[PDB]
Structure 1
Amino acid sequence: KGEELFTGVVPILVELDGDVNGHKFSVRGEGEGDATNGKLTLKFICTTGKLPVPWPTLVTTLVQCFSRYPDHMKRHDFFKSAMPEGYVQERTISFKDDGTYKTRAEVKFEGDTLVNRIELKGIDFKEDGNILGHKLEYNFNSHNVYITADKQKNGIKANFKIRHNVEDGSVQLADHYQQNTPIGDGPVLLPDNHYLSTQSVLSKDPNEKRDHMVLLEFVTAAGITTSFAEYWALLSVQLVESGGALVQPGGSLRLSCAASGFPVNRYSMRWYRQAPGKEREWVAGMSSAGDRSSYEDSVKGRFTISRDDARNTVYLQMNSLKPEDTAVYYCNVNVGFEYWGQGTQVTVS
């Protein structure tokens, strides 16, 4: 029933009130939402002067009922199920090595407009830091939001980590803990465990001189019909991973990565790596200008990232390789959309 309100374009209106470290602000936003394509087009402005925190830190807080649920997942779209009564979205955003956001929002229809009213508090944000220092690049990465039913609260939970690009090459983690409860006492859909794949592009309107963020993002859901034969093959190759590049403990290796379609010397570049039984972890990176290069604590002192502008390539010299350095290595770049280089298996004895 509630899914019949999202057929076709739907007007959206978003209103946020935020108190971060004492500094206060507000944001209004208008746009359309095509749940059929999982597409959002929204323009946001800071109605109260200029923003004390970066726009990328408010993206997640700034209506998952516009996510695209393919036909075979329509019994798991909690967000549309709760409409038009609405649902409450509470979340605790923990910026690593810095402050914490805390928000409460109500998403519900008002007439024929989907309205998100948000309250946001922020504490423990270092005055000279990535957030209040505006050290975050103006872009947004692609993330997977793992959703799971919360029977006792008659809603859903959601855990995920947002990776923000610091213009010094590093990455700012934002650990999201999320909870959603319907407003009306009517029937809602509790889903099997799944996830929401998200893509976002941040842009600016030239004719606007207010502090603004133009946002177009795509979201679709998946992850409920994976076969045992597939779950098993995943486990099998994990326990019997031969490897593509092998080195003794202490040896060295140099990773190459050729870029296509974009000038490598105008965007920041970063190296990720995913170890068996481990999640993707940022390794190294350098700024778009080339004046700054960052490294994670585990690799600092034996990794060096560089780039050849003419050959449009990025390198990763690896020295004194440990067995712990065994993983699949990826190159990353955000040209509005986040892109990944072909994986690279390095197997250290």
Structure 2
Amino acid sequence: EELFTGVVPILVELDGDVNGHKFSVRGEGEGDATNGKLTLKFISTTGKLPVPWPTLVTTLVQCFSRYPDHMKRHDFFKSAMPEGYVQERTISFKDDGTYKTRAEVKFEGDTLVNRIELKGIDFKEDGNILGHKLEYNFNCHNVYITADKQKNGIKANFKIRHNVEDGSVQLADHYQQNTPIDGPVLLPDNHYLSTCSVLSKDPNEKRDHMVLLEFVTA
């Protein structure tokens, strides 16, 4: 279950629907679990995204978190591998609409894959999300996990904060549940994850794209 030494390959596939605007993202990159570093590039295979890239970051692989030597046993994410887990989130933008996401995260071959459905409903076509009024950045957030023994897995809740192009700040409340898809697996006690992100572009890629680096530690 420790497939997580060395540079592991990542594929991410998301299919979205925000207010009927449909889009599709594919991303490929590397994950270094031992250092908790993710390096990825994402592309829109459906022309310019209806929504801002930063609001997709949390949706677009927490098994690659760096888990300390001391607490290495409260790592649900690798523990359910490679059957995978189901990660479900409800992301509720304050004063705007909400995303539903169901994702299966598991191994095909040597490769870690994250397959996402995202349904977005109730968005203003003129607020910060559908109106593309959000800056292209991403701060550091700490994701508060807890054991959900009633499904054998994880519940997190956390607030993401998107800087808005007008000095205001847009709130995105995340609720998250993770279940293990199959035998017994680990049940963390009560820890959180410190995640920081660098968002950037590739001067060569023409399609809607986000290049992304990330460090995650437990």
TM-score, with normalisation over the residues of structure 1?
A: 0.61
Structure whose alpha-carbon radius of gyration is higher? 1
String of CA shifts for 1:202-261, please: whole Å, max 9, x gaps. 000001001100000100xxxxxxxxxxxxxxxxxxxxxxxxxxxxxxxxxxxxxxxxxx
String of CA shifts for 1:176-200, please: whole Å, max 9, x gaps. 00000001x3121101111000000
TM-score, with normalisation over the residues of structure 2?
A: 0.98
Instruction: Give the drift of 1:8.
Output: 1.2
Unmatched runs of 5 consecutive residues or more in structure 2: none
Counterpart CA distance in 1 for 2:94 and 2:4 is: 36
Indicate whether 1:208 and 2:205 are aligned: yes
String of CA shifts for 1:8-40, please: whole Å, max 9, x gaps. 110000000000000000000000000111100
Instruction: Give the drift of 1:171.
Output: 0.8
String of CA shifts for 1:291-321, please: whole Å, max 9, x gaps. xxxxxxxxxxxxxxxxxxxxxxxxxxxxxxx
Counterpart CA distance in 1 for 2:169 and 2:71 is: 33
Instruction: Give the drift of 1:167.
Output: 1.5
- Look up the SS of the partner of 2:73 in the other structure: helix
Counterpart CA distance in 2 for 1:186 and 1:216 is: 33
Q: Say which structure is richer in helix.
A: 1
- Look up the SS of the partner of 1:74 in the other structure: coil
Counterpart CA distance in 2 for 1:217 and 1:56 is: 13
Q: Give 1:1-349 correspondences, 5 Å limit.
A: 3-183=1-181, 185-219=182-216
Counterpart CA distance in 2 for 1:28 and 1:7 is: 24
Instruction: Give the drift of 1:84.
Output: 0.7
Counterpart CA distance in 1 for 2:118 and 2:87 is: 12
- Look up the SS of the partner of 1:57 in the other structure: helix
- Look up the SS of the partner of 2:71 in the other structure: helix
- Look up the SS of the partner of 2:70 in the other structure: helix
Instruction: Give the drift of 1:51.
Output: 0.1
String of CA shifts for 1:27-73, please: whole Å, max 9, x gaps. 00000000111100000000011100000000000000000001111
String of CA shifts for 1:72-96, please: whole Å, max 9, x gaps. 1111000000001100000000000
- Look up the SS of the partner of 2:78 in the other structure: helix
Identical counterparts, % of pairs: 98
Over aligned residue pairs, what C-alpha RMSD do you find?
3.7
Counterpart CA distance in 2 for 1:156 and 1:127 is: 33
- Look up the SS of the partner of 2:135 in the other structure: coil
String of CA shifts for 1:116-153, please: whole Å, max 9, x gaps. 00000001100111000100000111000000000010
String of CA shifts for 1:279-300, please: whole Å, max 9, x gaps. xxxxxxxxxxxxxxxxxxxxxx
Instruction: Give the drift of 1:170.
Output: 1.1
Counterpart CA distance in 2 for 1:196 and 1:145 is: 5
Counterpart CA distance in 1 for 2:186 and 2:6 is: 21
Instruction: Give the drift of 1:5.
Output: 0.3
Counterpart CA distance in 1 for 2:91 and 2:2 is: 32
Instruction: Give the drift of 1:174.
Output: 0.2
What residue is the counterpart of 1:275 in the other structure? none
Counterpart CA distance in 2 for 1:202 and 1:70 is: 26
